[PDB]
RNA sequence: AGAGGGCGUGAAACCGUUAAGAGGUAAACGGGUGGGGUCCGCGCAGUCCGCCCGGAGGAUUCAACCCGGCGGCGGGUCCGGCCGUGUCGGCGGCCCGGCGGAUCUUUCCCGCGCGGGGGACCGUCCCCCGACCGGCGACCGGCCGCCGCCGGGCGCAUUUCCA
RNA sequence: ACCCACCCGACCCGUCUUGAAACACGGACCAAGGAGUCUAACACGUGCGCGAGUCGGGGGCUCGCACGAAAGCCGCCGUGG
RNA sequence: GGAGCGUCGGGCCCAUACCCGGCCGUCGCCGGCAGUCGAGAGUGGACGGGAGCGGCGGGGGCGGCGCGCGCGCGCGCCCGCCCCCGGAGCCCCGCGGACGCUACGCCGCGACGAGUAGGAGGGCCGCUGCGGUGAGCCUUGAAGCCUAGGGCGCGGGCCCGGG
């Protein structure tokens, strides 16, 4: 009875420890690949332009896939069409933000909420800093902080997304499984903008903070994240 | 060398002053005893700046130290000797108050019994 | 005034009815009195059926 | 400040039974435990029903229990009913059944047992089958109560067939202006 | 139990649950069924269709016992008799058929709802339905009129 | 049963005593004075109760038979233990643990006995400790 | 009489005084500190206790062990007997087992086709023993194992008490 | 928690009102009193008992009622609803 | 030579808003706990013959389904064992189970919290009387009254000291 079972339980124990090691190693290599993937993406955009510039030509790079959208005014006296879209972006509180994949449908929904949001095209670093510092899962409808990959995996592992790093790659490249990785993320509760804003009520173009500021959404991210 | 309680944490109180009743100051007919105002205009009941405060469940005590005396115990109002022997197995967490209406002969009888069982008494040196 | 569904009902408390309310606090005292009186009548009609005719 | 409506945040379902009776409450203690520790959703359904009102757990007639077990395949099983099992005088031949009920009326009890039927209590059902395996979970007709005949699109609202609350039926209790065509109109 | 009622919980509050714009005045509608035609009409003619108006024939000295005729359905006719009449029958082998005096049990009419078990009877009754008759015959029995 | 009669009793018994945000229970053979299911003398088929000895020296353990409750006269069975503290506990320990009787209780039964043997501490010694009584 | 003839208790408004404190934006109020008072808890070191251990002093009988007695628990062989559930056998209680029935019979009896009582019949409730099974907190008796108490044994590298 | 000081805050409540610190009314102060009741009828909800039934009244049988003008029982158990 | 007006910088100031943390409550979780292994769980266990360093010689996949804390192993001596928790000594224990379990109890995770009229829930809030119950309290002083005394409660209120 006894020594047979004990060894069986020790065997079990080991087979777990082995698997843990394995999945860890996968995670480690998956990152290493994504490091090489982002490098390759960055260079091969510059590569292109230089080559257009060598000819009397132009390289118009791709219009952006993905944008971060911060709600920059409050929750009083807000029109019903705006209000609905703002709760279709999950931007309920002021200074909540979400990633948002762009397309004719999506962009126009941002057009209907323009003077209620600041938004634009996040950096790589922005996607990291938001995910690591303020990455919270939706896990049985309980906002829970992504303390381990056992959380991400448990939920998103049916998509091939098994770690924080995978998540970041799904969000940033806007993969197949974006909708499901992006919805998994609870909307980002960011603090107030350190150093202040310019003007809440007016558009970026015209001095204020609202609307599309494209590249410059990253500065705002750093002073709020 | 008094009876120490088992655990003597820091009690920490959210509000110390009594909430008093609006215009209890101005009138002898109104008593301090809190009453929520129900007046249609009422500085207080609509939470203006500079007014008397309204009690909420917000001010509530921490559950660890709710009803905890300064000494660290909770009271338990003992009425005669037999009623003490309850506390026998607590003593480190509950003390014994003796009642006002108890006579100065059997007040004494309680106190010495509690002293055997090491139950702390909260009004012993008194009737005499 | 009626409010959303119910029997359009007619109570008969328009006369001065509280002047003619008839309570039943008697009834136990009554029930006994009859019963005594009954047992007395038996005893009077000595071997005759208590019933009657 | 956040925008949510706090309007339907509190779900209104029951948690315990509203009754204070001690035997039912023991059944609840038993089926809470089973509900939580078994995978059987039978236990959950049963548990849910123990908290419901008299109205909400209507009586299941013997004839209704017969015909529901007459159905093809649920043969050599046990019927379960969180309500009561009543007689049907308008059924005669009663097959030998297996039954669970909180109550069974004295007639219904005789008829079943005379047939060679077994009657079970709910504590007994649990020991017999803690995961509800091989059970027929029935229910009495919820919308039996005469109550419901007054519910719906009101009377005097075209194409409603909704009993009005009337002191007494008869020639001259309603049936004038608003039912006859001869008298005003009709709905 | 006043203890449980609502006025205990209203203590302190001004209006006593009747509001302060409009109040609790005495009889704002009119007393009772006032305004059945005017000013309460909608309630009357959407929850009491047919209150107003005469209909049908008067009948002066109605006496209910003349029209007394309590019915019973075939559904539960065998209920009137002891099970051991319905048992000593589907047995016996004489083809007897036991009597069921329905008027004894307090029903005058025999109407015809329900399936009657294939087991002959003699039903004595004051009145019968057409269908109740037919069903009874189909079982292999005989309806019997009584005064 | 045990549970059924606990349903009858839980809030109503004469032995219970609420007041001052606590609750308690005064029924005999309840070590820990709790109005609990576990710690209730009257309800359970097997019961433990550790009272002090009437002598003033020592402790009594109070088992309940199982033989026949219905007959309370015969139901409980008392046993004085008047031994060297450390021993007393062990005898109670074995009574409880090695008889497989009310195993749930047992540590509570030890602490009770312990507290009782504390009680029979010295009253005179306590008086000396509280007041220095030096130089008036 | 800090119960004095409208006198038990003797609240508040209001007044007198005594003590303390303040004082040109009517007072009063909320929040926040400070100062002073009133008492209350101390300490004439509060270094607070409790386990276990090591050493150092002092003192009673043990524990460990057997032996004798008592009591308790738990157990299976269900061993032997009482106990009761489901089933089967006795048709055995059935008339020495009663009620109920629109089941039957007026072969019966009694009273006047009906009432009462028998007599069949059915449904229900009780005796006899055997067998199987749930051996069920429903109990006893022996045997076993374990526990506890008392007394016997054990006098001291032990087991206690105390500092 | 008694008093005083100081900084900041701070208009008088009740009420009708779209709007009350209002040049809108009521209010010198304190004590005691003081206003959603009971009956009947309906409806829905909930709890319990019994369930094709259910029912209790009214009446009666059991006691001088200490507790009783209760409690119990009734081929009335169902005339009847 | 702005403390004005028009255009613009840095910098700093603070709301009950935003972020982090504490504490109270409410809602939600098919929430957990009536006593058990187990953290992307992706089995466990008979039992029979045949055998053994064999294994299941499958993707630059970057990997999840299979591998390097053992499967067989050290001991008794190629053969036997691979044994029992009344004792593995324990990070898991399926033999028994809280310090915890008033199961109307206890515990864990999230989220949220303006409010007239109005609605509902809970009040170990409060008053007076009745059935029960506290081997309650009371001339060794009840009720009430008063108190710059000590406390509890978010609060309704409450408890103690003195008079
Ligand atoms: Mg605005
Ligand atoms: Mg604007
Ligand atoms: Mg207003
Ligand atoms: Mg007569
Ligand atoms: Mg709200
Ligand atoms: Mg209202
Ligand atoms: Mg009003
Ligand atoms: Mg109105
Ligand atoms: Mg006097
Ligand atoms: Mg006087
Ligand atoms: Mg007097
Ligand atoms: Mg002075
Ligand atoms: Mg007006
Ligand atoms: Mg006006
Ligand atoms: Mg006003
Ligand atoms: Mg003016
Ligand atoms: Mg006016
Ligand atoms: Mg005036
Ligand atoms: Mg008053
Ligand atoms: Mg109802
Ligand atoms: Mg609120
Ligand atoms: Mg209100």
SS (H, E, C) B30-95: CCCCCCCCCCCCCCCCCCCCCCCCCCCHHHCCCCCCCCCCCCCCECCEECCHHHHCCHHHCCCCEC
List of residues 6+ apart from A27 with CB closer than 8 A: A149, A162, A163, A165
Residues lying close to strand G (Cβ under 7 A), chosen from 69-98 of chain B, are none
Nucleotide of closest approach to B14 (CA, C1') = I23
Instruction: List the one residue out of B58, B48, B118, B49 whose CA is nearest residue B90.
Output: B118
Which of F21, F115, F129 lies closest to B88 in CB terms?
F115
Q: CB B115 to CB F126 under 8 A?
A: yes
List protein-proximal bases of chain H (any atom < 7 A from a CB): 1, 9-18, 20-21, 29-31, 36-53, 58-61, 63-65, 69-70, 79
Q: Phi, psi at residue A133, to the nearest 5°?
A: -80, -30
Task: Tell me the C-alpha distance between F48 and F54, whole Å.
Answer: 18
Q: Where are the alpha helices (DSSP H) in chain E?
A: 6-10, 41-47, 83-87, 102-105, 130-139
Contact E95, E140 (CB under 8 A): no
C-alpha to C-alpha distances, E23 to C2, D52, F61, nearest whole angstrom = 18, 39, 71
User: Distance of alpha carbon D89 from its chain centroid, rounded?
Assistant: 20
Whether the beta carbon of F86 falls within 7 A of nucleic chain G: the reply is yes
- Experimental technique: cryo-EM
Q: Among partner residues D90, D157, D177, which is closest to E52 by beta-carbon distance?
A: D177
- Chain B residues 42 to 101 whose Cβ lies within 7 Å of strand H are 42-43, 45, 48-51
DSSP codes, chain D: ------SS-S----SS-S---HHHHHHHHHHHHHHHHS--HHHHHHHHHHTS-TTTS--EEHHHHHHHHHSTT--S-EEEEEEEEE--TT-------EEEEEEE-HHHHHHHHHTT-EEE-HHHHHHH-TT-TTEEE----GGGSGGGGG-SSPSSSTT-------S--STTSS-STTTSSSSS---
Residue where the block lists tokens 């069409």? A81
Residues 13-52 of C with CB under 7 A from strand H: 13, 24-25, 27-32, 34-36, 38
d(CA F80, CA F60): 4
Provide, in whole angstroms, the distance separating residue A219's CA from nucleotide I11's C1': 19
E43:C10 CB<8 A: no
Cβ neighbours of residue E103 under 8 Å, at least 6 residues apart?
A: E124, E125, E126, E146
F97 CA from centroid of ligand 14 (Å): 85
DSSP-derived 3-state class of residue A86: helix
Nearest CA in chain F to D30: F3
Distance from CA of E56 to the nearest CA of D (A): 7
Taking CA atoms, what residue in C is nearest to D162?
Answer: C5
Q: Answer for E79: CB within 7 Å of strand G.
A: no
Whether residue A164 contacts residue A154, with contact meaning beta carbons closer than 8 Å, is answered with no
CA B40 to chain centre: 35
What are D61's strand-pairing partners? D86
Q: Is E134 on the interface with D (CB under 8 A)?
A: no
Cα dist from B69 to B1, B63, D28, D109, whole Å: 18, 13, 40, 62
Gap between the Cα atoms of A65 and A59, Å rounded = 17
d(CA E95, CA E88): 11
In this complex, the residue with its CA at the shortest distance from the C1' of nucleotide I157 is B33
Residue of chain C whose Cα is closest to the Cα of D156: C5
CA distance F52 to F60: 6
**Which chains sit next to A, with 3 or more Cβ pairs under 8 A?**
D
**CA separation, residue E38 to residues A5, C7, D182, E30, F45 (Å):** 90, 19, 21, 11, 75
Contact B34, B19 (CB under 8 A): yes
Residue with tokens 């019963």: C35
| Resolution of this structure in Å | 4.7
Phi first, then psi, for residue F68 (nearest 5°) are -165, 90
Residue F40 burial (C-beta neighbours within 10 Å; 0-12, 13-18, 19+): buried
Q: Which tokens is E25 given? A: 């005045």
The answer to whether chain E touches chain A by having 3 or more C-beta pairs less than 8 angstroms apart is no
> Half-sphere exposure of residue B71, counting CA atoms within 13 Å on the CB side?
18
Distance CA D33, CA B24 (A): 54
Residue of D156, D157, D179, D183 to mutate, testing the E interface (most E Cβ within 10 Å of its Cβ): D156
d(CA B107, CA F19): 20
The CA radius of gyration of chain F, in Å to the nearest whole number, is 18
Residue identified by tokens 């109605």 is E62
> What SS3 state is found at F10?
coil
D35–chain A nearest CA distance, Å: 20
Rounded CA-CA distance E59/D129 in Å is: 66
E81 strand G contact, CB < 7 Å = yes
Q: Using the CB atom, is residue D110 less than 7 Å from strand H?
A: no
- Cα-to-centroid distance, B41 and ligand 15 (Å): 5
* Rounded Cα–Cα distance for residues D62 and D88 (Å): 5
- Residues linked to residue F64 through DSSP beta bridges, in sequence order: F76
Contacts of E47 in chain C (CB under 8 A): 2, 4-6
CA–CA separation, D130 vs D34, rounded Å?
Answer: 7
E3 Cβ partners below 8 Å, 6+ apart? none
Residue F116 tokens, joined: 């009782």
Ligand 14 centre and the CA of E20: distance in Å? Answer: 16
What length is written for chain D? 187
Q: From residues 32-51 of F, list those within 7 angstroms of strand G by Cβ.
A: 45-46
Residues C9/C15/C16/C22 CA torsion (nearest 10 deg): -70
Phi and psi angles of residue A211, each rounded to the nearest 5 degrees, phi first: 85, -175
For residues E73 and A201, give the distance between their C-alpha atoms in angstroms, rounded to a whole number: 81
The alpha carbon of B89 and the centre of ligand 11 are apart by a number of angstroms equal to 48
Strand order in the sheet with E71-73: E71-73, E109-111, E127-128
CB A211 within 8 A of CB A205: yes
Reference D45, options D85, D81, D79, D98; nearest CA is D81
Tell whether the torsion through CA atoms of B49, B50, B51 and B54 is positive or negative.
positive
Using CA coordinates, name the residue in chain E closest to C5: E47
Query: What sign results for the dihedral spanned by CA atoms A38, A39, A41, A42?
Result: positive
Question: Is the CB of E53 less than 8 angstroms away from the CB of D183?
Answer: yes
Considering just the CA atoms, what is the radius of gyration of chain A in Å?
A: 22
């Amino acid at each position: 009875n006894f020594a047979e079972l004990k060894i069986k339980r020790l065997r079990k124990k080991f087979a777990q420890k082995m698997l843990r090691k394995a999945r860890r190693k996968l995670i480690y290599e998956k990152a290493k690949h994504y490091h090489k993937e982002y490098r390759q993406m960055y260079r091969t955009e510059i590569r292109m332009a230089r080559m257009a510039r060598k000819a009397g030509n132009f390289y118009v790079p791709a219009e952006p896939k993905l944008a971060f959208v911060i709600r920059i005014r409050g929750i009083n006296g807000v029109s019903p069409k705006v209000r609905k879209v703002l709760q279709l972006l999950r931007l309920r509180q002021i200074f909540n933000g979400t990633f948002v994949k762009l397309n004719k449908a999506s962009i126009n929904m941002l057009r209907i909420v323009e003077p209620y949001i600041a938004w634009g095209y996040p950096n790589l670093k922005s996607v990291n800093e938001l995910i690591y510092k303020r990455g919270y899962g939706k896990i049985n409808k309980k906002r829970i902080a992504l303390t381990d990959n056992a959380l991400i995996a448990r939920s998103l592992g049916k998509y091939g997304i098994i770690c924080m790093e995978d998540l970041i790659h799904e969000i940033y490249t806007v993969g197949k499984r974006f909708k499901e990785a992006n919805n998994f993320l609870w909307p980002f509760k960011l603090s107030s903008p350190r150093g202040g804003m310019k003007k809440k009520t007016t558009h970026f173009v015209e001095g204020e903070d609202a609307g599309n500021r494209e590249d410059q959404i990253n500065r705002l991210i750093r002073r709020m994240n | 060398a008094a009876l120490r309680p088992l655990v003597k944490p820091k009690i920490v109180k959210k509000r110390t002053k009594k909430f008093i009743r609006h215009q209890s100051d101005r009138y002898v007919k109104i008593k301090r005893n809190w009453r929520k105002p129900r007046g249609i205009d009422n500085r207080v009941r609509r939470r203006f700046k500079g007014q008397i405060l309204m009690p909420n469940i917000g001010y509530g005590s921490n559950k660890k130290t709710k009803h905890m005396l300064p000494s660290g115990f909770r009271k338990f109002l003992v009425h005669n000797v037999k009623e003490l022997e309850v506390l026998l197995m607590c003593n480190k967490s509950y003390c014994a108050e003796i009642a006002h209406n108890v006579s100065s002969k059997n007040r004494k009888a309680i106190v010495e019994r509690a002293a055997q069982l090491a139950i702390r008494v909260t009004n012993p040196n008194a009737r005499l | 005034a009626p409010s959303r569904n119910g029997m359009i009902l007619k109570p008969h408390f328009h006369k001065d009815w509280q002047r003619r309310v008839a309570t039943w606090f008697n009834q136990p005292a009554r029930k006994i009195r009859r019963r005594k009186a009954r047992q007395a009548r038996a005893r009077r009609i000595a071997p005759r059926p208590a019933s009657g005719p | 400040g956040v925008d949510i409506r706090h309007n339907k945040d509190r779900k209104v379902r029951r948690k315990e039974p509203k009754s204070q009776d001690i035997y039912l409450r023991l059944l609840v203690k038993l089926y809470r435990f089973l509900a939580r520790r078994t995978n059987s959703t039978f236990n959950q359904v049963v548990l849910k029903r123990l908290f419901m009102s008299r109205t909400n757990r209507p009586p299941l007639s013997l004839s209704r229990m017969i015909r529901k077990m007459k159905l093809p395949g649920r043969e050599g099983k046990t019927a379960v009913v969180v309500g009561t099992i009543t007689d049907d005088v308008r059924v005669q031949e009663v097959p030998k059944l297996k039954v669970c009920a909180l109550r069974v009326s004295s007639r219904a009890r005789s008829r079943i047992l005379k047939a060679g039927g077994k009657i079970l209590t709910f504590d007994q059902l649990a020991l017999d089958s803690p995961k509800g395996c091989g059970t027929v979970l029935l229910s009495g007709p919820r919308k039996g109560r005469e109550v419901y005949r007054h519910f719906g699109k009101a009377p005097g609202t075209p194409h409603s067939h909704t009993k009005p609350y009337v002191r007494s039926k008869g020639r001259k209790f309603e049936r004038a202006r608003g039912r006859r065509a001869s008298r005003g109109y009709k709905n | 139990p006043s203890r449980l009622r609502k006025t205990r919980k209203l203590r302190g509050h001004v209006s006593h649950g009747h509001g302060r714009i409009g109040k609790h005045r005495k009889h704002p509608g009119g007393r009772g069924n006032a305004g059945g035609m005017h000013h309460h009409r909608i309630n009357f003619d959407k929850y009491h269709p047919g209150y107003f108006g005469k209909v049908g024939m008067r009948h002066y000295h109605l006496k209910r016992n003349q029209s007394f005729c309590p019915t019973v359905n075939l559904d539960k006719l065998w209920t009137l008799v002891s099970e051991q009449t319905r048992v000593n029958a589907a047995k016996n082998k004489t083809g007897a058929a036991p009597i069921i005096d329905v008027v004894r049990s307090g029903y005058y009419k025999v109407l015809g709802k329900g399936k009657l078990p294939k087991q002959p009877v003699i039903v004595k009754a004051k009145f019968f339905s057409r269908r109740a008759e037919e069903k009874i015959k189909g079982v292999g029995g005989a309806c019997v009129l009584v005064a | 049963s045990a549970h059924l009669q606990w349903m009858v009793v839980r809030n109503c018994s004469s032995f219970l005593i609420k007041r001052n945000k606590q609750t308690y229970s005064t029924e005999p053979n309840n070590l820990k004075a709790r109005n609990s299911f576990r710690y209730n003398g009257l309800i359970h088929r097997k019961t433990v109760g550790v009272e002090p000895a009437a002598d003033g020296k020592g402790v009594v353990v109070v088992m309940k038979r199982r033989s026949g409750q219905r007959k309370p006269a015969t139901s409980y069975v008392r046993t004085t233990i008047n031994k060297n503290a450390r021993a007393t506990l062990s005898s109670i320990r074995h009574m409880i643990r090695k008889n497989k009787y009310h195993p749930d209780l047992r540590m509570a039964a030890i602490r009770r006995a312990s507290a009782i043997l504390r009680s029979q501490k010295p009253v005179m010694v306590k008086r000396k400790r509280t007041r220095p009584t030096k130089s008036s």
